[PDB]
Amino acid sequence: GSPILPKAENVDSICIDFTNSIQKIYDDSESIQKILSEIATGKRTEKQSIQDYPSAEEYGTINIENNGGMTTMFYYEENGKYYIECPYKGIYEIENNFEDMI
Numbered sequence: 001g002s003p004i005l006p007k008a009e010n011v012d013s014i015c016i017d018f019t020n021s022i023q024k025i026y027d028d029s030e031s032i033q034k035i036l037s038e039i040a041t042g043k044r045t046e047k048q049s050i051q052d053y054p055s056a057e058e059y060g061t062i063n064i065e066n067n068g069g070m071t072t073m074f075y076y077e078e079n080g081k082y083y084i085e086c087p088y089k090g091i092y093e094i095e096n097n098f099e100d101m102i
Contacts, residue, residue, distance in 0.1 A: 002040040003092065006066040008033045017061040018099065026102075038101045042084060042092035049090040054083075060099065 014026040056076035074085040084092035
């Protein structure tokens with residue numbers, strides 16, 4: 001069962017400040033749509049995200065700017081799995097890395 005993302009075609013841009021000093025902006029159709037695949041691969045599971053931030057300290061910063069609003073979110077590795085932040089549906093356990101797949 002996937003996340004409920006915005007559309008692709010209503011995304012104004014997506015900004016990803018990486019963990020390092022570099023940032024990439026996904027403003028092409030193909031750049032956005034690729035993200036909206038691998039960001040939808042994981043399972044937030046039936047848990048409760050009673051949080052609004054990660055508990056890692058090393059992560060990238062993401063803004064999906066869409067319809068002039070955004071979904072802010074953050075991703076990280078913990079204990080050997082990777083994870084994606086969100087409100088009450090943000091415990092997306094994935095078994096693969098984010099940054100190598102973008």
